[PDB]
Amino acid sequence: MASRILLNNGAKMPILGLGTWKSPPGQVTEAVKVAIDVGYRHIDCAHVYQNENEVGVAIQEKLREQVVKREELFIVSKLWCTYHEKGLVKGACQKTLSDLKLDYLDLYLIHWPTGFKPGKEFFPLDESGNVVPSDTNILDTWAAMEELVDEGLVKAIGISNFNHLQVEMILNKPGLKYKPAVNQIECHPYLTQEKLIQYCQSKGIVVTAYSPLGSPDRPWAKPEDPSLLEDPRIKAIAAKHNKTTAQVLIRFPMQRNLVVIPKSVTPERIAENFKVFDFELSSQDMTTLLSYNRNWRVCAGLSCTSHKDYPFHEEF
Numbered sequence: 001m002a003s004r005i006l007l008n009n010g011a012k013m014p015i016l017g018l019g020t021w022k023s024p025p026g027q028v029t030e031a032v033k034v035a036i037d038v039g040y041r042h043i044d045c046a047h048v049y050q051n052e053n054e055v056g057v058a059i060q061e062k063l064r065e066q067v068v069k070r071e072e073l074f075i076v077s078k079l080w081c082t083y084h085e086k087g088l089v090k091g092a093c094q095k096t097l098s099d100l101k102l103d104y105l106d107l108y109l110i111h112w113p114t115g116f117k118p119g120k121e122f123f124p125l126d127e128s129g130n131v132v133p134s135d136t137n138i139l140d141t142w143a144a145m146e147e148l149v150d151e152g153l154v155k156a157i158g159i160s161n162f163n164h165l166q167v168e169m170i171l172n173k174p175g176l177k178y179k180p181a182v183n184q185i186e187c188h189p190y191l192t193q194e195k196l197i198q199y200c201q202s203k204g205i206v207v208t209a210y211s212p213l214g215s216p217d218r219p220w221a222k223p224e225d226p227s228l229l230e231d232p233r234i235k236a237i238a239a240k241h242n243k244t245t246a247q248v249l250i251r252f253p254m255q256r257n258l259v260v261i262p263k264s265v266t267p268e269r270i271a272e273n274f275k276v277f278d279f280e281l282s283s284q285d286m287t288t289l290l291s292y293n294r295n296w297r298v299c300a301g302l303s304c305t306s307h308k309d310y311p312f313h314e315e316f
């Protein structure tokens with residue numbers, strides 16, 4: 001298992017990265033420092049996570065310490081929904097760059113296909129509680145992303161939470177200049193994503209799997225929800241391989257040619273989650289894990305289902 005996957009922009013992306021959604025600002029600097037110290041070279045970020053400044057403190061310290069060189073790091077962020085208009089994209093990217101202490105991103109993603117009204121609120125609401133959409137579509141937002149490549153702000157651009165028809169829309173964009181390098185989507189044994197993964201891979205788009213552990217700290221968790229880390233069937237595969245359940249859950253997408261971005265702020269788990277390059281799941285293990293699909297989403301976006309561009313009506 002090689003550590004990096006070749007993107008369609010010619011750059012290599014580490015297949016294991018550290019997630020940062022929900023990482024508290026007072027803990028994420030140490031989390032990222034530990035991650036870099038134990039071998040991580042890819043950090044997944046976003047402006048909407050409200051902790052990019054603190055992630056950046058860690059990156060800058062490790063660069064200053066010469067633990068790593070900038071060229072060895074692969075830093076990803078995402079354009080939030082209230083910045084889809086063409087005149088806001090550059091400033092949104094530049095705020096992320098400033099916060100992260102960087103002069104370029106390795107990858108910048110459209111975070112969700114849904115554009116929302118610009119303003120201070122990340123979810124602008126009407127008086128009846130619906131999110132207020134923007135009238136800027138995925139194709140004009142894509143053109144604005146392409147400009148960022150041509151200005152040197154980002155090395156690669158991609159998409160996140162795009163369904164296959166939305167991916168196709170960009171691939172079919174009149175005058176398309178750069179194809180999306182990555183589609184970052186939720187993926188784990190309860191949401192196995194066979195259809196969307198094969199489509200993206202067939203087009204040379206690399207898929208990153210988010211919430212690979214089932215996001216046990218998601219703010220809307222309910223006790224009745226299924227739990228990957230506690231599933232006895234997955235625990236049994238882990239025991240057979242003398243690994244933890246989390247390690248199996250991280251290795252699983254790796255063997256599907258996916259990138260995977262488990263989140264932790266716990267030093268011992270950050271280190272544990274990286275020790276996944278020294279064992280192999282069998283084909284039978286892989287097919288068994290795939291069999292657990294139930295189309296269950298951590299990020300279902302139920303408050304966004306009437307948006308012209310809500311992604312999860314379509315089968316995939």
Ligand SMILES: NC(=O)c1ccc[n+]([C@@H]2O[C@H](COP(=O)([O-])OP(=O)(O)OC[C@H]3O[C@@H](n4cnc5c(N)ncnc54)[C@H](OP(=O)(O)O)[C@@H]3O)[C@@H](O)[C@H]2O)c1
Pocket residue numbers: 018019020021022044045111160161184185209210211212213214215216217218229244246247261262263264265266269270272273298299
């Ligand atoms: N593009 C998108 O729309 C989108 C959406 C969701 C997520 N993401 C990205 O994907 C990342 C990962 O997804 P996620 O944060 O939803 O959840 P996740 O990575 O599936 O799970 C994180 C949770 O698992 C715990 N954990 C981590 N390692 C563990 C281990 N070895 N044993 C037991 N528990 C462990 C963490 O606890 P501690 O931190 O307390 O250790 C935390 O509660 C995000 O942080 C974000 O970067 C992107």
Ligand SMILES: O=C(O)COc1cc(F)ccc1C(=O)NCc1cccc([N+](=O)[O-])c1
Pocket residue numbers: 021046048049050081112114299300301302304307309310311
């Ligand atoms: O979107 C993520 O990366 C994780 O989830 C969130 C993180 C945040 F910091 C804030 C909000 C979310 C969140 O609600 N994310 C879900 C979401 C957002 C936008 C649009 C949709 N949609 O289905 O169209 C869904």
